[model samples]
Target chain A: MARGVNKVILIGNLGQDPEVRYTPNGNAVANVTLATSTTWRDKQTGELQERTEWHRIAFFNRLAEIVGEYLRKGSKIYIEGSLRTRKWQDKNGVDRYTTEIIANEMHMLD
Target chain B: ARGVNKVILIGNLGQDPEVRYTPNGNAVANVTLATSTTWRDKQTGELQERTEWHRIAFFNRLAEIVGEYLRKGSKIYIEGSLRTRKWQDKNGVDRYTTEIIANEMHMLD
Candidate 1:
């Protein structure tokens, strides 16, 4: 009742390696992409089905540095963070929006 | 090469969970959760609080468990994943919504 919660958790394999960048103030940020999926039985046909999902992850400051230093594609990681949406305009002046998970805590899940 | 998706939240229930049964007899539960954060304002040196509300969902056995034990004002912890759904509204406009598709849940209070 005293604090707001905006959190997210992801335990998945990295789609690619970290691409680290720095802000003007010299802070590190690493962008990561991950995906998760499962297979299930098709209700009527009783056939197996599969579906997949992808997520964009942003690691800030120390977490960013850690990911950059020690993680790579095929690496399994656990990430905890919050959701944030960005709204901006494209070069052609079209509206655009994207939701990103900003990670504050991350560790190797495997 | 691979993908990961996960979510975790600790908050109070804003309302009693609404549980429904599927044609296959599987249970689905939906609820609104409220959570707040408090901090001192840097400029004013005064305490500030922020509350956020989220839509949560559970299915199958997990739904049955949440429906049985959780109520309005109950503090709970949820571990799940983010799911975005696309639907059409009454006016036929396309709409997108995001919600937590909960799996693991624990009552904190």
Candidate 2:
């Protein structure tokens, strides 16, 4: 049995349209950005503050194709995924890392 | 209505717990966890593998308990909420940091 778990559940709005690409074996892969905002009272300022974070979501194969077809900018949705980070190099030859949600379940709320 | 941003993780600890006391005398623990996955590549049919590292923050009584009981390589399950905070770095530039605020935790083996 597998002894590891990494799950994420997010409800947010799409920042833009999905980007769909196909693999060498003709499997579809999609990527989308989502925005989620949270509000809290600042202790120092005594005022309400809001922070919006953007998440990178990815879908594979059948789910990827469906997301590309139906989701759009500003669409409200829910998703379940696992966290994955990719490593790459920049133009200056410096190493970089980007974390993304490997989405497995997607639901459109509105 | 507001949105929900939750995180669930089951992984092994990368380090022993680091506990700190707040100004209000509340105990808080910070730790890094590791999780891995393996899958077959569609094109080459070869297994691919990767590991993800997560930062977890635990507070109050739970933090004290975790600090006392858990050690490096301990497996645990955690339920938490994703929180991103904006802060200033040493260079006076704004930086964003992400961590999971743990609400529930259970030790496994």
Candidate 3:
């Protein structure tokens, strides 16, 4: 069987400023919340419909450094990434899964 | 800012891949994948399905890996960007088309 592919591409506005941090090994990691919208006119009702989706995207190392320098809240951007689901536990030992987009390539659209 | 190009497809293989080697010794592979979308037609009150056949191309290391494992009827997921190419044919005709250059792929279980 052909293998699976986990890739995401987004052209949208940033919902917030980048969050930057340094890993224990001195690698830079950054995160940003992206807002993408889908809009169309409803044919049956002849009305406009708009929907917004929010995605949390993370960048590492060199990409993270780039985000920290050039990106900010409300910036328009294009991103290409892969999905990564992280599993962790809380103080009560409850398991939680956080799905994130690990962006490797990013371009500013505006 | 002008054009946004990307694609995602999950479907079955239509045929086995055709693998070739460049004169420079780099491997390139080509395959056809079929993705179908099913929907009910409101006017006709019947079920309808649309099948989209995608021409996928891979290169170098990825091409060699795919040529070995993928076969006809295999379920696959592809994630890549779209690229449009222009070239001249043998008959001196101009040709243009789009293809998916996939660097990310996995076999569905």
Candidate 4:
């Protein structure tokens, strides 16, 4: 049995066009930048406030291809995924860490 | 139209549960839950893990159920919408907090 749930559900807009790349094993992967917003009323200033959070999301295999073909910047999508962080080396041989949501389901809202 | 901002999490509770009553006789409960993820490193082939904590809120009947039954370290599933609230701190500073407003919940353990 799984130990814990790492699920993340997002209903937001794509920040940019999906980037699709092919792996050495001939599998397709896609990356998208998603944006979600939260709004609230300021207690002190008594004004409305809004905040937007950006997420880096990845899709794999057939889902990757489908997302690449159907989604674009400003398109609204609902996604269910798990958080994943991976390490990579930059061009200067510096190690960097990147966190992303690995999408298992994607539905276009617009 | 209202936007869709939702979250689903399954994790362990951080503290024993309690419910507070509102002026309207409604009950509310707040909990801190932790979830973890594991992966294998590509280069090192070693396992890596990380845990994230979330603040969850339950209201009315759900709050009563959670408060009466859930204890610290109990596993649960939560489905909720994300909401942001603004408040004043002790130093008279404005602060913003994000929390989940649970619509459904299930005891997992």
Q: Candidate 2 lDDT, tens digit per residue, A1-110?
A: 34578899999998888889999999999988778877888899888777677777889999998998999999999999987755445589943334678898988999
What proportion of the true contacts does each candidate reproduce? 0.43, 0.45, 0.03, 0.29
Predicted candidate 1 versus true structure: per-residue lDDT over B14-99, tens digit per residue = 88899999898999998877667787899999888765667788999999999899899999988886776444558984433456
Tell the DockQ for candidate 2: 0.32
Q: What TM-score does the predicted chain A of each candidate obtain versus native chain A?
A: 0.79, 0.82, 0.80, 0.83
Structural similarity to truth (TM-score) of each candidate: 0.63, 0.75, 0.48, 0.57
- On lDDT, the candidate that comes out on top is 2
* Candidate 3: stretches off by over 4 Å: A1-3, A87-98, B1-74, B78-109
Candidate 2: misplaced stretches above 4 Å? A41-51, A86-98, B37-50, B84-98
For candidate 1, give the DockQ: 0.24
Q: Write the per-residue lDDT of candidate 1 for residues A33-91, one digit (tens) a residue.
A: 77666666789999877666667788889888999999999888888887665444558
Candidates sorted by DockQ, best first: 2, 1, 4, 3
Q: Each candidate: RMSD to true structure?
A: 7.4, 5.8, 21.1, 10.0
In model 3, state the lDDT of residue A84: 48
lDDT of 3 by residue, B5-41 (tens): 3557787787888899999999999887766656578
lDDT of 4 by residue, B1-109 (tens): 2345567788899788767999989999988777877778899997787676667789999999999899999999988865544445489843334556799999988
When summed lDDT is taken over every stretch of 10 residues in candidate 2 chain B, the lowest stretch is B88-97
Place model 3 in a CAPRI quality band: incorrect
True contacts kept of 2: 0.45
Ranking by TM-score: 2, 1, 4, 3
lDDT of 4 by residue, A1-110 (tens): 34678677888898788889999999999998777877778899988787676667789999999987999999999999875544445589943334467799998998
